[PDB]
């Protein structure tokens, strides 16, 4: 009935696509003269106020387990960490034999944790040598066949780099923004499991502040829920998929290192220095972390109540400790002010639940030669820190796992897991999606072009 093709430009149509995002950093702490391992000089300042646009009658489909933003964030974090350790001292001449002996002195019983080692080291002049001593943890030295012979644990895999002493490891919020022609969709559904149609879709200019916190078996300083404890998994039937838990209310954890350290500088070359622990003044005590018993019990009860819905109605829920493996996957590993902790989370996951001012002290261990990002051939030798360190944090999540069930029911045991850093950022980049705007369309009107 006299209908002809009409071209419209600028129609609101979008399709799924993958692109590269950039920074947006707050200007409050952007101007300070403090260097961080996550660079800020290459990130543009953020907008003074975000622009939130609500979409009516729009129903999009999200999927938290197939998002490219997590992979891009992982690549950027790894690249930043690799770039932050370049311009300064490399500890190649430290692969020498050592004459180590027990520290003793004040031992509360840390019997063999610390060792007093002496060695020969080069000086600024090429033809002279100096004899110095340093204190090393038991997790860094390996005996080679009373003053016995020891050696560093990395002296047969790779000569590594010393951590730059001018940088800091404190996380800072990072915003990711899409380029022109691309939009970010935000799911505002409070009860969303990360996978499926979202009723409340809202166009957001960028993202919020996401702190790159590195931890295992627990989530520290994350995003809390709004209504109830949320359990999200890719396949709840499969036992080979990790389970992500989000806490409604955060519990408090305090960590400290009671020893008062003392850092001394040793010159190993022209313009190069090595930082060692000379003496410990005071008393020697173990590092520990504490969790309030009642708040943890209430949080675990809420987790059990919200976990009962998926599995059954009369099955018992049991919590056990880790199974085995490396030290980084069986302990709660984190960073407190520049010192790396490895805490024993065995008194936390120890309960059995039936359908019918105390604190929990967690012993921890400290290591100086670490190897993160699950790589082989690179270290990050953290220098000693003078004084006493303390940290107060929030526990706003869990990474649980399930064992192979027997008799198909009547028991379900959950133990903590971890190891992969993508699960840390999947818990925060779950409400976001990237789309590509297509502005060209055709529709039938009754125009005929003048001839």
């Amino acid at each position: 009935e006299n209908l002809w093709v009409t071209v419209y430009y600028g129609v609101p149509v979008w399709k799924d696509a993958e692109t590269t995002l950039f920074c947006a950093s707050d200007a409050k702490a952007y101007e300070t003269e403090k260097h961080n391992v996550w660079a800020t000089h290459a990130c543009v300042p953020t907008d003074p106020n975000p622009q939130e646009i609500h979409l009516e009658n729009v129903t999009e489909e999200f999927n938290m387990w197939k998002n490219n933003m997590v992979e891009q964030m992982h690549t950027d974090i790894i690249s930043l960490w690799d770039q932050s350790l370049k311009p300064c001292v490399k500890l190649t001449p430290l692969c020498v034999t050592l004459q180590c002996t027990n520290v003793t002195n004040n031992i509360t019983d840390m019997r063999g944790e610390l060792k007093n080692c002496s060695f020969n080291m080069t000086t600024e002049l090429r033809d002279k040598k100096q004899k110095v001593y340093s204190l090393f943890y038991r997790l860094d030295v390996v005996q080679i066949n009373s003053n016995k012979e020891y050696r560093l644990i990395n002296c047969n895999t790779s000569a590594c780099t010393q951590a730059c002493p001018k940088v800091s490891f404190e996380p800072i919020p990072i915003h990711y923004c899409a380029p022109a022609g691309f939009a970010i969709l935000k799911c505002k559904d409070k009860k969303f499991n990360g996978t499926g149609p979202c009723p409340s879709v809202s166009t957001v200019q960028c993202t919020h502040g996401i702190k790159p916190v590195v931890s295992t078996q627990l989530l520290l300083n994350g995003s809390l829920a709004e209504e109830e404890v949320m359990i999200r998994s890719e396949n709840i039937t499969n036992n080979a998929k990790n389970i992500l838990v989000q806490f409604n209310t955060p519990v408090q954890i305090n960590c400290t290192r009671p020893n008062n350290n003392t850092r001394k500088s040793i010159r190993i070359g022209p313009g190069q220095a090595f930082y060692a622990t000379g003496d410990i003044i005071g008393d020697i005590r173990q590092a520990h972390c504490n969790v309030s018993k009642a708040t943890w019990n209430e949080t675990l009860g809420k987790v059990v109540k919200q976990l009962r819905k998926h599995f059954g109605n009369n099955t018992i829920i049991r919590f056990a400790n880790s199974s085995g493996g490396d030290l980084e996957v069986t302990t709660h590993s984190f960073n407190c002010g520049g010192e790396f902790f490895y805490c024993n989370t065995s008194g936390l996951f120890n309960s059995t639940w039936i359908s019918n001012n105390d604190s929990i002290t967690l012993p921890c261990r400290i290591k100086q030669i670490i190897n993160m990002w699950q790589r082989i051939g690179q270290c990050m030798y953290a220098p000693p820190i003078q004084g006493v360190i303390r940290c107060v944090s929030n526990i706003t999540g869990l990474i649980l796992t399930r064992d192979g069930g027997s008799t198909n029911s009547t028991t379900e045991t959950f133990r903590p897991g971890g190891g992969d850093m993508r699960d840390n950022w999947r818990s925060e980049l779950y409400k976001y999606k990237v789309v590509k705007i297509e502005p060209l369309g055709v529709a039938p009107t009754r125009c005929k072009r003048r001839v």
Binding site: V7, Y8, Y9, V11, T203, P439
Partner: protein, 125 residues
Amino acid sequence: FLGFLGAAGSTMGAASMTLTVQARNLLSGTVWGIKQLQARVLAVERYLRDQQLLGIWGCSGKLICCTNVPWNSSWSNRNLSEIWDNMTWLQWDKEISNYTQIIYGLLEESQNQQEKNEQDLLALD
């Protein structure tokens, strides 16, 4: 004000009045040293190709442009009455997506290529 992509759930009759909002948002202005330098070039090239395609037709600098191609290839099987008042632009792309490569060639041969030839032979005299 509805803002960018404000009329995404609105009908076709109310979404065609805000084409200017989405028209201007398609062109705005070592880690993070080559990311932008490769994103902006792609953003420029995606816009230039669309502006060349819209213009090898007879529609050069107009946001709404209606031509003289009959409604034969694109089988909507639906009348204008329940299209501009009972459907949104997102649902339209789901129906006509197979016929958007045999309608982009009827706008380049049956229109503004033949049409540009009798005009060249009529200003001759």
